[PDB]
Amino acid sequence: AHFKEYQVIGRRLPTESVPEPKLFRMRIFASNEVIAKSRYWYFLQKLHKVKKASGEIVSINQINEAHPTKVKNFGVWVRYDSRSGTHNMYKEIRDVSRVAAVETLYQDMAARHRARFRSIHILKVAEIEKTADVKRQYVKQFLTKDLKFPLPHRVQKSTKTFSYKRPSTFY
Amino acid sequence: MKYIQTEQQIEVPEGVTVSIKSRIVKVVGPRGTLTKNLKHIDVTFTKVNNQLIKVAVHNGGRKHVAALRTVKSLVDNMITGVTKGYKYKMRYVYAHFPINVNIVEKDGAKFIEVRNFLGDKKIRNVPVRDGVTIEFSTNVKDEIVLSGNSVEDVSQNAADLQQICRVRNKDIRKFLDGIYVSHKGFITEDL
Amino acid sequence: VEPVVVIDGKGHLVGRLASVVAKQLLNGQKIVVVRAEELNISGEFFRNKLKYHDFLRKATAFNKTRGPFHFRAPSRIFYKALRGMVSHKTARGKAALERLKVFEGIPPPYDKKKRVVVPQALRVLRLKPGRKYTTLGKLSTSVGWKYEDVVAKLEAKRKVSSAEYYAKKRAFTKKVASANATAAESDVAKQLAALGY
Amino acid sequence: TDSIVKASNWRLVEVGRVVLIKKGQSAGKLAAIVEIIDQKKVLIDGPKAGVPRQAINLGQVVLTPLTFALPRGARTATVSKKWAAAAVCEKWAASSWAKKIAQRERRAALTDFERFQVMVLRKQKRYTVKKALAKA
Amino acid sequence: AESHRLYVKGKHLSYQRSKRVNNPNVSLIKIEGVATPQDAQFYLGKRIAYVYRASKEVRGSKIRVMWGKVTRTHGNSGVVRATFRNNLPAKTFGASVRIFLYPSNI
RNA sequence: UUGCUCCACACAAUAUAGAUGGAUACGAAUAAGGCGUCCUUGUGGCGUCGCUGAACCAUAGCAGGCUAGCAACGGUGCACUUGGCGGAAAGGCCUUGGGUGCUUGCUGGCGAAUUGCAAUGUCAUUUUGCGUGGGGAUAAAUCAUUUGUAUACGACUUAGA
């Protein structure tokens, strides 16, 4: 859905042999807190020997974008499962926020590789602070000086079923 | 990857004049005039300084930006054809039977006739598109020159003349006879 | 809103126009469709020709006279596409189909009438620029329609007459524009402009 | 003679281009394209009209023929300053487009007595223009 | 004048139905002009008359009326649901019908 | 045994796939156009418009009465009337002239009630019949007989004041 970013901090259950566990933290893009905690436990089960029964979640907090109205470029490292194997990818996206960047990434992966949310693992998303470190053409294209382009062939959808003049696609 | 802007440039020499309404291009030069319909290609034109014209495509795919360079080459071929002209030199190739090529007038339409191609009794008659002038050139044996402004008309007429003299039911590696285009150039080369 | 709606089928898509007209007829609007020889089908001409040949190959084996009739005219092709979308085997479907007339060209009852368009079935508004399409008149005369040139001649004559009409209409409306331009800027004109007219 | 090419210019999208928000919460206000995010969406701001600074798909706005000077990524204070300096509000209002919209909403806001009044005034103006349309 | 209409024209589209089962107790009415339920909410509770003619005069008139009312909106395009005292005869699919401005809330 | 057709209105019957202000006429392109203006008339220059018909026209009066006047010399209906044009299914479009009626372009006078607090509250067009009174025209086909270029029978092809 429309994604929200959370930090999920959890730990193992405290024992007398070892109190104060090490308080692992993840950043999860999910639609709500339930899916956030689910993906947190899923990744912690893949990384460490812990599960939801043996652990607890000490905090979950929504991370809003610091500047939600600045246009950023994000480099996103992704692991996804194809029909034959597992692959790593690096895609870079020009977008205004991290949640919308991963949203259009999920749409792009589902469109170009038929990869689903159950297959895509977000390794990381990091904002490229300096241009000319962008290496993909489709986003390097929008970084030229005095950028401008037209919008040819305007289609204005009508509310009536019949029109009384031939419509024009001028702009 | 949806290139938001690609463009080529065409140079317009001094003697020529280019008139482009919607996508109908008309070039007028010393050798005459030429026209072309391009309403199937979906590009845009822009005159800069009456001697340079940019042709552009926006938000175009791979095939679209390929066709933009194609139409640039088409319009500058028209320009160089109305300035310099186009001249295709073809040779007759035979082993034993001398090919007898003349010009007849059926309905007054300037037909090219080919007799004795490999000694057959069939007379092959290929028509001549307008704007193409044919001269059987002296000082070179077995040589015919097709000249004109339209490279399309000249080259397609030469291809028709070549394809009408194809050998059937024989090894074409041994029976190399026919009428083949040897040279393509301009009427005013090294101008 | 109108008793009869006259649709100029030029530059329209066959299936989208048919699905519009079918629902309009079933709702009870009388529709006449003219210039069915200028309809468009998405897809390249050879592709649609192969489609029509595969339809044309189908026939009742023991008697071709009772088979699916393969009509060749563009109006009848549009009518077939529309009868596919109307439940024509009932009285309601028959009554709906009697509210529909299709013509090639524009016949003299309707050449003096106002022709409308359907913007959600127009090729320039629906097809991506670059996609190939075909013309229904060209397909019909390729597959056996015999009357493509006579409708071209009749439409040329009709266009001459209609341009000779539009010249006078344009002269009269520029006269009207001059008249109400001089009769603007009055008290009543300023009051109407204040009131929104 | 000289070569002629029909230019066919139309309403480039760039920074400083004024757009009319077609649909949404604003739905008829003006904004200015602050940045171009991608081929289809832009970061706009309409701070004088009360439009929040936001990213938006270009199918939700209509581009006006107006354009004023802006650096890319300008914040809303600079946008408001340059907007008031270039004075694009009354320049938009002087156009026939905004006049058509104002005429539409005025006709929508007319009451029945006002409809009767415009009927009578239209009859009077019809009489005088039809009297005028007999001497030429 | 030349106009005397104090109602809105509408069309009797169909009954309430599934893909294969109808329900003649509820009719669907397309009011002309309206294209959304937000505008169709103005017409809820308004009286509807289907006015038809017969050859036999009953009580001074060869014109017979079936009365009903608007109940709710149907869909996203301004179609409304209507109920009648006796249901509509189903030969009037596509027939015109009159939606009166009373009972008014203006 | 005075039949048939057309025209006028007079009364009946018959229905309605569904009036309830107006189907309101260029063509072409859409990575282009429309309109206005100007010139050296073009694939011309300049200006302007679109971003919906939410338009334009019509629209006040007893379901639209009876009257008076002012201003213009228009607008519109009806019945004529002149001249055209239209053959794709033309059966319609335009125009001349006069007559007659209305005019809400403007100012006045009188009337409406009681259908009782709503009840489509009835005003359309489709066909047929019967009467009047005014024109207009006064046939064929079939069976039977016959033919044989035809034929199971029908049918077909012929002939017969």
From Swiss-Prot, chain A:
Keywords: Cytoplasm, Isopeptide bond, Phosphoprotein, Ribonucleoprotein, Ribosomal protein, Ubl conjugation. This is Large ribosomal subunit protein eL20A. There is a cross-link at residues 124, 130, 148 (Glycyl lysine isopeptide (Lys-Gly) (interchain with G-Cter in ubiquitin)). GO terms for biological process: cytoplasmic translation. It comes from Saccharomyces cerevisiae (strain ATCC 204508 / S288c). It holds the Pfam family Ribosomal_L18A. Component of the large ribosomal subunit (LSU). Mature yeast ribosomes consist of a small (40S) and a large (60S) subunit. The 40S small subunit contains 1 molecule of ribosomal RNA (18S rRNA) and 33 different proteins (encoded by 57 genes). The large 60S subunit contains 3 rRNA molecules (25S, 5.8S and 5S rRNA) and 46 different proteins (encoded by 81 genes). eL20 forms multiple interactions with RNA and proteins in the central protuberance, connecting components of core functional centers that are located far apart. The modification Phosphoserine is found at residue 31. HAMAP family: Ribosomal_eL20. It is found in: Cytoplasm. It comes from the Eukaryota. One of its GO terms (molecular function) is structural constituent of ribosome. Present with 54300 molecules/cell in log phase SD medium. The gene is RPL20A. One of its GO terms (cellular component) is cytosol. Belongs to the eukaryotic ribosomal protein eL20 family.
From Swiss-Prot, chain B:
InterPro entries: Ribosomal_uL6-like, Ribosomal_uL6-like_a/b-dom_sf, Ribosomal_uL6_a/b-dom, Ribosomal_uL6_CS2. It is found in: Cytoplasm. The keyword Ribonucleoprotein applies. GO terms for biological process: cytoplasmic translation. GO terms for molecular function: rRNA binding; structural constituent of ribosome. GO terms for cellular component: cytosol; cytosolic large ribosomal subunit. The keyword Iron does not apply. Keywords: Cytoplasm, Ribonucleoprotein, Ribosomal protein. Present with 52400 molecules/cell in log phase SD medium. There are 2 genes for uL6 in yeast. Component of the ribosome, a large ribonucleoprotein complex responsible for the synthesis of proteins in the cell. The small ribosomal subunit (SSU) binds messenger RNAs (mRNAs) and translates the encoded message by selecting cognate aminoacyl-transfer RNA (tRNA) molecules. The large subunit (LSU) contains the ribosomal catalytic site termed the peptidyl transferase center (PTC), which catalyzes the formation of peptide bonds, thereby polymerizing the amino acids delivered by tRNAs into a polypeptide chain. Belongs to the universal ribosomal protein uL6 family. This is Large ribosomal subunit protein uL6A. The gene is RPL9A.
Swiss-Prot record, chain D:
GO terms for molecular function: RNA binding; structural constituent of ribosome. N-terminally acetylated by acetyltransferase NatA. Belongs to the eukaryotic ribosomal protein eL14 family. The keyword RNA-binding does not apply. This is Large ribosomal subunit protein eL14A. Component of the ribosome, a large ribonucleoprotein complex responsible for the synthesis of proteins in the cell. The small ribosomal subunit (SSU) binds messenger RNAs (mRNAs) and translates the encoded message by selecting cognate aminoacyl-transfer RNA (tRNA) molecules. The large subunit (LSU) contains the ribosomal catalytic site termed the peptidyl transferase center (PTC), which catalyzes the formation of peptide bonds, thereby polymerizing the amino acids delivered by tRNAs into a polypeptide chain. It is found in: Cytoplasm. One of its GO terms (cellular component) is cytosol. InterPro entries: KOW (IPR005824), Rib_uL2_dom2 (IPR014722), Ribosomal_eL14 (IPR039660), Ribosomal_eL14_dom (IPR002784), Translation_prot_SH3-like_sf (IPR008991). Present with 45300 molecules/cell in log phase SD medium. Keywords: Acetylation, Cytoplasm, Ribonucleoprotein, Ribosomal protein. PANTHER family: 60S RIBOSOMAL PROTEIN L14, LARGE RIBOSOMAL SUBUNIT PROTEIN EL14. Coiled coil: none annotated. It comes from the Eukaryota. It comes from Saccharomyces cerevisiae (strain ATCC 204508 / S288c). GO terms for biological process: cytoplasmic translation; macroautophagy; maturation of LSU-rRNA; ribosomal large subunit assembly; ribosomal large subunit biogenesis.
From Swiss-Prot, chain E:
It holds the Pfam family Ribosomal_L35Ae. Keywords: Acetylation, Cytoplasm, Isopeptide bond, Ribonucleoprotein, Ribosomal protein, Ubl conjugation. Component of the ribosome, a large ribonucleoprotein complex responsible for the synthesis of proteins in the cell. The small ribosomal subunit (SSU) binds messenger RNAs (mRNAs) and translates the encoded message by selecting cognate aminoacyl-transfer RNA (tRNA) molecules. The large subunit (LSU) contains the ribosomal catalytic site termed the peptidyl transferase center (PTC), which catalyzes the formation of peptide bonds, thereby polymerizing the amino acids delivered by tRNAs into a polypeptide chain. GO terms for molecular function: structural constituent of ribosome. Belongs to the eukaryotic ribosomal protein eL33 family. This is Large ribosomal subunit protein eL33A. PROSITE patterns: RIBOSOMAL_L35AE. There is a cross-link at residue 46 (Glycyl lysine isopeptide (Lys-Gly) (interchain with G-Cter in ubiquitin)). N-terminally acetylated by acetyltransferase NatA. The lineage of its organism: Eukaryota, Fungi, Dikarya, Ascomycota, Saccharomycotina. Component of the large ribosomal subunit (LSU). Mature yeast ribosomes consist of a small (40S) and a large (60S) subunit. The 40S small subunit contains 1 molecule of ribosomal RNA (18S rRNA) and 33 different proteins (encoded by 57 genes). The large 60S subunit contains 3 rRNA molecules (25S, 5.8S and 5S rRNA) and 46 different proteins (encoded by 81 genes). The keyword Ribonucleoprotein applies. The modification N-acetylalanine is found at residue 1. The keyword Ribosomal protein applies. One of its GO terms (cellular component) is cytosol.
